[model samples]
Target: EIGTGFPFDPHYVEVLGERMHYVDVGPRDGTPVLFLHGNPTSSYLWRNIIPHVAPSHRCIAPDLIGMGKSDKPDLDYFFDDHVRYLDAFIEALGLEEVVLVIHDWGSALGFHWAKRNPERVKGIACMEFIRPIPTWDEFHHTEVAEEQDHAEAARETFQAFRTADVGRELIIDQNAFIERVLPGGVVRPLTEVEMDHYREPFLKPVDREPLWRFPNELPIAGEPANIVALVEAYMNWLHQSPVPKLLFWGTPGALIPPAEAARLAESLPNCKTVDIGPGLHYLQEDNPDLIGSEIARWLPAL
Candidate 1:
C-alpha cells in the first residue's frame, strides 16, 4: 500500500467526468495552498515535502486526471485537457484565494489559470519549469553560451524528445522517465519503495500515453501556438502583479538555468528567487524541509 496519513489522506472527487484523486490536508479553515505536479509525476511527487505546510495552510495536491490514482480517461491528455480538468477541480472544490506551487507542466497549467483568473490566486511559488513557452523562432534563433537556448546538445535533446519513435519507445514503452529521467533529476538516489510508488500508475501501456505525448507537445515549430500564447499571457501578468511569487532553483539543472531564472525575476514585480544550492530539477528530493520552511516563512509577509 502507498502509506496513508503521514503525507496525505486520500480523497476522490468527480471533476469533468473523471475521478480526480487528491490529498486534502490541514485545517478546513486554513488558508488554501494548491500544489500541482508535472509530466510523469502525480501529487505523490510532493509527498514528504509539502505536507509540512499542512499545519498553517490548507494544502491540496491533485493527481492530474489520467495520472496517479485519478481516473484514466480515454483521451490524448493534451494541454487543453489538463487545463479543463484543473479548472473543473477548482470549481468543484470552490478553491479561492489559492496559492499555487508548481513544477514542470504544473507551471504551464497553473500560470494559465493564474493569468486568466488573477483575482483568485493570492500567490505562486514554482521551480524547474519551462517558462514563457518561447516561440518556435525564438527557440531556434537564440544561443547564449552555456545558457538554455536550444543549441548543440540542447537542440539534439529537444529534437529527440520531440521525435515520434524515440519519445514513444523511451517514455511509453520502457517507462524511461520513471527509470531514468526522474532519477536523474533528483540529487539523491531514490529508494526502491519510493520509485515503486512513482512507477505504479505508469506501469500499463494505456496509462503511459500522457508520458509519451508531453515531450512532443512543446510548442516547437509553432505547432502548439496556443500553449505559447498562454505562457506569454501569464508572463505579461507576471510583469505586473503585486501578488507574491518565488522561483526556487538549483544548479546543474537542464530545465531552468541561472540566467533565465534571473531574467524572470528581473521582469516580475514583487517576485523573488532563492538559490537552492544542492537541489537539481527535483528540489523536493534534496531540500524538502527547506522548501517547507521557506514557504512558511514567506507566507506571513505575503
Candidate 2:
C-alpha cells in the first residue's frame, strides 16, 4: 500500500493557457495550506500528509505545469516558466494568506514567490529544497564524513543530468529520472502502483522535458545567473523577514541534513526545525504520518 489513499478529487484551472492540476480539499473557509511538490512527483506526494491537517486547513497541492496531470503546452520548461504558471494558478484560485508546505524544487519556487508577496504568506514549511548552493567542488567538499560520499555521488549524477546529450539520453530516452532517480530518492521502496502513478505523466520522451531542465536550473557555480540571483534574494529575505518558518529534515538527508537544518534555524528568523526520523529527499513517503501530525499541530499556531 502507498499508505494513505489519494482520496482528494482533482481540480483544474487555466494557467498560462494550460490546464493545471491541483487538489483543493478541506473546509473552504479554513486557512489555505498550499502544498507545492517538486520534480517527477505531484500532489500524490501529499496523500498521507494532507489528511492529518485537512480537517482544520484548506489544503491545496498543485502539480507544476508539464510535470503531473497539468497540460504540457509547447514551451521551454524553464524555472521562470514554472514561476509564471504557479503565480497564475494562485491568482486563478484566489487563495489568500497561504501557508506554504513545500519540498524539493517546489520549495525553491515557493520561497521565490513568498519573498515577493510576503503579505500574502502566512507561514512556510519546507524540506529538501534548492537554495543558494556553492560551486560544484564546494558542494561536494562537506566536512561531514557521512555526507561526503553522498554529496559526491549526487554531484556526479546531477552533473550527468545537466549535460546536454547525456541528460537527453538518460531522462528522455531512458526515462531514468522516473525509473531510477525517484525510487532511489525514497528510503522505503515504493509499491509498483505508487511508482506507476508518478510515471503516468512522463511516460513519453517528450513529456520528460521538465525533469531534464530542472537539474540545469540549479545555480551551482553561478552559471544559471538568474536562478542564483533569485535564490540569493530569497535567502536574504529569509534572513531578515520575521515570517514564521518551519523546517522538516531527516537523518542523512540528501539535501537538508540535520546539521543543515540547525544552520537554517540559526540563520533564518522565527524558524524551528523538526527531525522527521530516517528519510532521503522524499521524506513524505518515508514519514508521512509524522510529517502530517507535526504540520497539523503547527498549523493552528501560525
Candidate 3:
C-alpha cells in the first residue's frame, strides 16, 4: 500500500463538506508555489519534483476531491467542482503571490483560480497541459469517447487492463509508454518509477472509481451553465491574466501535441515555451532533474 503521511506535515481545511488536504512546505515566510495535477492522478503527481523545491520555497500540493488522499464524498465530480474546491483550498491556506505549477486538468483549474486573483499569483509553470482557450480542441479525442461513454464498462475494461501482464509490463517500462499509451495510442517511453506513481492512487479496484468517473465527466461543452461558466471563467482568465507563464512540453506526448504547445505560447502574452525533448505524459518522471533544475532557475524570478 502507498504510504499515508504527507511528504511534509499537511494541513487540512473543510470545503464543500469535505476535508481537503494540502502541504505547505519550507518556511512559513517563504514564497509559495502551488502545484496541481490532473485526471486519474493527484497531488502525488509532483512527488518527484516537490522535494527538490520544497527546501527553499513554500510548496503547496493538494489532492483534488475524489483523488489522492482528499475526501471522496459521493458528490458530482464536474470540472467546476474541481475548481470550486481549489478556490477554497487557496483561500483556506491563505496562499498569496503564488507561483502556479499545473498539469493537465490542473492547468485549467489553476488558470481559473489565478484569473480570479491575478494579483495573488507571481508566475506559472505548466507542463503537458494547456489553458482553456476559446477554441481549444486538442484534448477532444473522439476515439476515447466511446470507451468513456459507458462508465461501468469502461471501469471493467480498466480493471482488466490493470490486471493483465502486458499492461503491467507496459506500465513498468522505462519509456513511460503505458502512462502515455491511451485509447488514441500515443507511444512514448515511461520509466518504471513514474508508472508506479501513476498507478499508486488506483492500487485497488475500488480506488479506480474516480479514475473511471473522470473521462465521463468531460465533454461538458453544451452541458449545464455550471460547466459552461467554469470553462468561460478559465478562458476569460487566460485571455486577461498577464502573469508570467512558462510551458515545459515533452515531445511526442500523446495528448498534448507539439503544435498545441506552440499555439498556447503564441496566444498567451506572458508565456514562454520549452521542449524537454522525448518524454511521455509524466514529464517529471522521464526527466525529473531537468524539471527540477528549471524550476530552481525560475524560482528566483518569481
Candidate 4:
C-alpha cells in the first residue's frame, strides 16, 4: 500500500549503491515535474502538494539519500553525497525537460542541476528555497538578523545545528528536526501521526547523519566554499535564465521571505509569486492546498 498520505505507490531506484525512494506517478505522456526534498525530510515533504498536479503532470518526488525511506549507508551525508545520488536518480529516471518543484535543500540542488543543463529544465516552482545568496550574511539573512524575535530565534536554532557538538546533541541525540524544527516551521502544530512519519526514519542516531550534517553545510562564515560558488553561479543563471519561475512564500519563510520572493519574481522574466498563508520555513505544511493549486494553475501557463 501507499504510505505517508501518498495516493500512489513509491518505487525504489538504485542511486550509486544507495536505495533512492521516490514517488513517480501520473501521466507518462504528460509534462514531467520533479519534487526534491531536503534533509530530515523526503518525498513525504511533497505528499500534500503532488496530488493536485498528478492528474495532469508526471509527478516525481524523491527522498534524497539518508532521508525518508531511502537506505542510509554508513557514510558522511554531505552536499556531495546527495548530489551524487540525485544525479544518478535523474539519469536513471530520464527526467527530461523537467519542471523542478523544490524546497529546502532541493532548491540548491535543483538550481545547480538546472544551471549546468538548462535545456533539461523546462521551468521552476519553488517555496522557501534559496535564491543566489552568495555572501555569508546574505545566506543567513533574516530581515534584521537578531534584532527581531523570529530573527533572534532563528539565529539560536541555526547556531545549535551548525555547532558540531551541539548539532549532534540536538539533532542526532534528541531528534530536533521533528520535535523542534517541524513545529517552528509550520503554522499549526502537527498531529502525532504526522510527527511519527517524519521521525520514523531517524529514530536512531546513526540514521540522522543528513539532519546533523545539513546544518553544518550551510556555508555560513565563508566555510564550505564549494557551495558558495554554486550558489553564485546559479544566482547568475536565475537573474537571466529566461525560464518560467514561480515562487510561493508565507508570512515568515525560511530562506526566502515574501519580500525576497517578490523581488526574485520581479527580477526574473516570466516569473510570478503566490501567498500560501501565515506560515514559516515549511510553508507546504501550512497551506498545501493553496500552494498545490497555485502551482497547478501556474504550470499550464508555463
The runs of at least 3 residues in candidate 1 whose Cα sits more than 4 Å from the true structure, single-residue gaps closed, are 1-7, 133-155
Q: How would you encode candidate 3's per-residue C-alpha lDDT over 161-225 as one tens digit per residue? A: 34535333433332222244331232344445545655665565444554544444443434334
Error of 1 at 76 (Å): 0.7
Tens-digit lDDT track of model 2 for 143-206: 6786788888878988898886999999889987899889888888888789888888977898
1 or 3, which is superior by TM-score? 1
Question: Which pairs of residues have clashing backbones in candidate 2?
Answer: none
Q: Which candidate should be chosen as best, given lDDT against the real structure?
A: 2
Q: Per-model C-alpha lDDT, please?
A: 0.76, 0.86, 0.63, 0.79
lDDT of 4 by residue, 193-279 (tens): 777878887778877778888888875655678776777778788888988988888776767766687787688788888887677
Residues 189-250 of candidate 1 have per-residue lDDT tens digits of 78787888888887786578887777777756555777767666776777788888888877
Q: Which stretches of candidate 2 lie over 4 Å from their true place?
A: 1-4, 140-142
Q: Candidate 3: which stretches are off by over 4 Å?
A: 1-7, 130-200, 203-207, 219-229
In model 1, pairs of residues that clash are none
Better of 3 and 4 by TM-score: 4
Count backbone overlaps in model 1: 0
